[PDB]
């Protein structure tokens, strides 16, 4: 929704597929883009936790 911030590494602002929220900065990313699925207990985006994707 309008107050849910989508900031994925793909750079596309669209709400489709399985999406996951960073635990610290609240941004949403596409699981497929980030290489994860909902079975993770804790998630941080690539800016809160720099790493190759």
């Amino acid at each position: 929704g309008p107050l849910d911030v989508i900031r994925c590494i793909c750079g596309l602002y669209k709400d489709e597929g399985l999406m996951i929220q960073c635990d610290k900065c609240m941004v949403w990313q596409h699981c497929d883009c980030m290489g994860v699925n909902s079975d993770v207990e804790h998630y941080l985006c690539e800016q809160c936790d720099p790493r190759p994707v």
Binding site: E16, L18, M19, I20, Q21, C31, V40, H42, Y43
Partner: peptide, 6 residues
């Protein structure tokens, strides 16, 4: 972790 799917 918090997930959704629309």
């Amino acid at each position: 972790a918090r997930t959704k799917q629309t």
